[PDB]
Design a protein around this motif. Structure first.
Motif, mmCIF file in Angstrom:
data_model
loop_
_atom_site.group_PDB
_atom_site.id
_atom_site.type_symbol
_atom_site.label_atom_id
_atom_site.label_comp_id
_atom_site.label_asym_id
_atom_site.label_seq_id
_atom_site.Cartn_x
_atom_site.Cartn_y
_atom_site.Cartn_z
ATOM 1 N N UNK A 151 47.045 29.321 34.582
ATOM 2 C CA UNK A 151 47.586 30.496 33.865
ATOM 3 C C UNK A 151 46.693 31.728 34.152
ATOM 4 N N UNK A 152 45.360 31.537 34.201
ATOM 5 C CA UNK A 152 44.435 32.618 34.547
ATOM 6 C C UNK A 152 44.663 33.055 36.014
ATOM 7 N N UNK A 153 44.849 32.091 36.946
ATOM 8 C CA UNK A 153 45.132 32.404 38.346
ATOM 9 C C UNK A 153 46.409 33.252 38.435
ATOM 10 N N UNK A 154 47.487 32.820 37.747
ATOM 11 C CA UNK A 154 48.790 33.494 37.742
ATOM 12 C C UNK A 154 48.721 34.932 37.217
ATOM 13 N N UNK A 155 48.071 35.164 36.064
ATOM 14 C CA UNK A 155 47.925 36.527 35.531
ATOM 15 C C UNK A 155 47.164 37.425 36.519
ATOM 16 N N UNK A 156 46.041 36.921 37.095
ATOM 17 C CA UNK A 156 45.191 37.692 38.015
ATOM 18 C C UNK A 156 45.905 38.101 39.309
ATOM 19 N N UNK A 157 46.799 37.233 39.832
ATOM 20 C CA UNK A 157 47.602 37.514 41.034
ATOM 21 C C UNK A 157 48.511 38.736 40.729
ATOM 22 N N UNK A 158 49.143 38.724 39.537
ATOM 23 C CA UNK A 158 50.034 39.779 39.061
ATOM 24 C C UNK A 158 49.270 41.106 38.920
ATOM 25 N N UNK A 159 48.056 41.066 38.346
ATOM 26 C CA UNK A 159 47.141 42.199 38.190
ATOM 27 C C UNK A 159 46.767 42.823 39.558
ATOM 28 N N UNK A 160 46.371 41.996 40.537
ATOM 29 C CA UNK A 160 45.980 42.461 41.872
ATOM 30 C C UNK A 160 47.158 42.918 42.753
ATOM 31 N N UNK A 161 48.374 42.393 42.506
ATOM 32 C CA UNK A 161 49.591 42.808 43.227
ATOM 33 C C UNK A 161 50.043 44.173 42.680
ATOM 34 N N UNK A 162 50.026 44.334 41.328
ATOM 35 C CA UNK A 162 50.374 45.564 40.612
ATOM 36 C C UNK A 162 49.419 46.711 40.951
ATOM 37 N N UNK A 163 48.078 46.463 40.932
ATOM 38 C CA UNK A 163 47.040 47.441 41.308
ATOM 39 C C UNK A 163 47.167 47.844 42.787
ATOM 40 N N UNK A 164 47.942 47.080 43.554
ATOM 41 C CA UNK A 164 48.147 47.295 44.982
ATOM 42 C C UNK A 164 46.975 46.858 45.843
#
Length: 340
Positions: A151-164
């Motif tokens: 769940x931590x891996x999944x949230x962080x992927x979303x954060x780094x994709x959104x930040x570009x």
């Protein structure tokens, strides 16, 4: 070379300790952990095959260190074997019991050539940097569990994709692939250390920025409960910071002595201490909050008096009175300070 005159191998084969098929195959039988450092001309080509084998879900077993090192050497050392074998990371690993044996091998097309015969039997959109930075995302919650970690891996992927900042193949985001990485991260000291050492000791590359952020987020992972207990048993005064007077009572003596001993062993790791549970560093098992129920009850008592809880601290019936005594002591301490 020559005959096996100690009679050790024959004793082992005859008593079932070494399988017969390890020597009689239709092969060889083999303090320090020796890691073959494979010196190649086609490092980027080998690295892509390594990534591909991980994507296919291969378990390299004893060969994992050799190939994960090749990925680090390619990404963080540009392929410079000399710069790597001289690095502070290798100096730490040499002191930790690792021995790096350089092996010169050219004209390698298959991973099988570099190589437990199950590995050779079983034999990408991403680079070595992405493999490593994706693995780094597991570091903050690896010691907690799979669910929490994935769940931590999944949230962080979303954060780094959104930040570009970075994007990973969609095939890597499956629970199945994440599990493979989780299993690899759980067992492998080398990769976890290499990631921590890099994230710790570095002053632009999107992957390196991800690794650094993951390592900062992983500080004190699996040590946060005992750390908050330490914060609540420390008392800030006008004279400075002291141990809570309840931790100094006779019934708490043996426990506070074990705590002090375990805290000293952790402190010996210095800058590495905040990663001691992640790296399973010497003496870390002695610093588990469950080993100190009285200190945990004093800590929760102090927190309760300020209207807070201490996440992960479960005070049993046997320690409830000490918790209540600590809540009262804290309420009294605040009263004798408000009047002043």
């Amino acid at each position: 070379p020559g005959p096996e005159l100690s009679g050790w191998i024959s004793e082992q084969l005859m008593t079932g300790r070494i399988p017969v098929s390890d020597i009689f195959c239709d092969c060889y039988a083999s303090r320090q952990r020796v890691i073959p450092v494979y010196q190649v001309n086609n490092l980027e080509e080998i690295c892509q095959l390594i990534i591909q084998a991980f994507e296919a879900g291969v378990d390299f077993q004893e060969s994992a260190d050799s190939f994960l090192l090749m990925l680090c050497l390619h990404h963080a050392y540009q392929g410079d074997y000399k710069l790597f074998l001289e690095s502070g990371a290798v100096k730490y690993l040499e002191g930790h019991g690792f021995r790096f044996e350089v092996k010169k091998r050219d004209g390698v097309k298959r991973l099988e050539e570099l190589l437990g015969k199950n590995i050779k039997r079983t034999l990408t959109e991403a680079n070595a940097g992405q493999f490593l930075s994706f693995a780094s995302l597991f570091l903050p919650k690896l010691v907690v569990g799979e669910k929490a970690c994935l769940e931590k891996v999944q949230r962080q992927i979303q954060v780094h994709a959104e930040q570009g900042l970075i994007q990973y193949p969609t095939a890597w985001q499956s629970v199945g692939h994440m599990m493979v990485i989780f299993r690899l991260m759980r067992t492998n000291f080398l990769i976890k250390f290499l990631l921590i050492h890099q994230g710790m000791h570095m002053v632009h590359d999107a992957n390196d920025a991800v690794i650094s952020n993951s390592v900062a987020q992983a500080r004190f992972s699996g040590l946060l409960i005992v750390k908050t207990v330490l914060d609540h048993i420390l008392q800030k005064t006008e004279r400075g910071v002291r141990l809570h007077p309840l931790a100094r009572t006779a019934k708490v003596k043996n426990e506070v002595n074990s705590f002090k001993a375990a805290l000293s062993s952790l402190a010996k790791h210095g800058e590495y201490a905040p990663f001691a549970r992640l790296l399973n560093l010497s003496g870390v098992n002695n610093l588990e909050h469950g080993l100190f129920p009285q200190l945990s009850a004093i800590a929760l008592g102090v927190a309760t008096a300020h209207g807070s809880t201490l996440a992960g601290v479960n005070v049993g019936e046997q320690y409830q009175q000490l918790r209540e005594a600590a809540t009262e002591a804290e309420k009294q301490l605040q009263q004798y300070a408000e009047s002043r």
